[PDB]
């Protein structure tokens, strides 16, 4: 035999195929698997990898965030070049906290109705990945973006709330119930707010 102690611990868990039932998602996966295999661009490979992820791992993005990052990229651009196309593998939602935006071209899997209205009324354009593959088949002059995951209630609940240094929320339906011994100094003790490392 061969001494291979603990070699199964080096294998990694990765997804090869989609669990989605959407035929249009399947068509997009077919196109971008072809492109990622037959082209050298890194854009196509990243896009193909992201199309296979689960819904929870494709977080939605905000129109205001798109505008802010595009402006920060634009202030250092030669002003003789066109602005890049914003590309998000996910959903784009509208933001009522920001009224005035510039005109941009955004490619996405799905748009909110109000977000599509805002982009078009600002003079911009909404795009599908099938049009993007015709316009920029290697991903030249693009800005690939991701949405935010921290901030979710499920993430804010992770871990034990009773150990020192932790600020996770407990699972409780009655907000006034767990507010006593263990959380106040006047009771037996209080869970410490800070711990080094």
């Amino acid at each position: 035999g061969v001494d291979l102690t603990g070699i199964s611990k080096k294998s990694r868990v990765i997804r090869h195929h989609t669990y989605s039932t959407n035929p249009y998602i399947k068509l997009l996966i077919k196109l971008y698997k072809f492109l990622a295999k037959r082209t050298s661009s890194g854009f196509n490979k990243v896009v193909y990898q992201r199309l296979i992820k689960s819904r929870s791992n494709r977080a939605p993005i905000s129109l205001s965030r798109i505008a802010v990052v595009m402006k920060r990229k634009a202030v250092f651009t030669a002003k003789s070049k066109a602005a890049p196309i914003a590309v998000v593998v996910g959903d784009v939602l509208d933001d009522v906290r920001m009224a005035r935006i510039p005109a941009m071209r955004v490619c996405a899997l799905r748009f909110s109705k109000s977000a599509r209205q805002s982009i078009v009324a600002a003079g911009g354009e909404c795009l599908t990945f099938d049009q993007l593959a015709m316009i920029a088949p290697t991903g030249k002059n693009t800005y690939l973006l991701r949405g935010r995951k921290s901030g979710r209630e499920s993430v804010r609940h992770f871990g034990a709330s009773g150990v020192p240094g932790s600020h996770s929320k407990p699972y409780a339906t009655n907000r006034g119930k767990e507010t006593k011994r263990g959380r106040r100094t006047g009771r037996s003790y209080k869970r410490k707010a800070f711990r080094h490392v």
Partner: protein, 144 residues
Amino acid sequence: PTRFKKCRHQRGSTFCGYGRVGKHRKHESGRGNAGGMHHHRINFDKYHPGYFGKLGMDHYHRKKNPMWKPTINLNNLSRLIAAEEAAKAAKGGTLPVVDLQSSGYAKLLGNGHIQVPCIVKARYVSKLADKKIRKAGGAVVLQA
């Protein structure tokens, strides 16, 4: 659906995943939330701090209707103005009028930067919200 459950996969395995040594017995820990101070103390203290004890004053006959008081922020006011008036609005001119108690709000808070100036009618307002909206060119009118 029954055909997807784990029992179907366990037909033929005599123990059904509960072991030979320690078995699947009736109530090996007590029933319900028993033992919270004796033999489940670690679980209770690590995952639910604050569970045991008393705190604060009592209030015998609570009515929620007299305490009703929803709030809305300054940078969310465009949710209450129709899109035709919002573009026409301009500081120093004619402004849309928003009635909060008819849209289901009682207090106006002052978080963020206001986007469309307007006249707001509210039962309550915070001092920073009042200052900010006056500087932006609107006003607050108290109502009941």
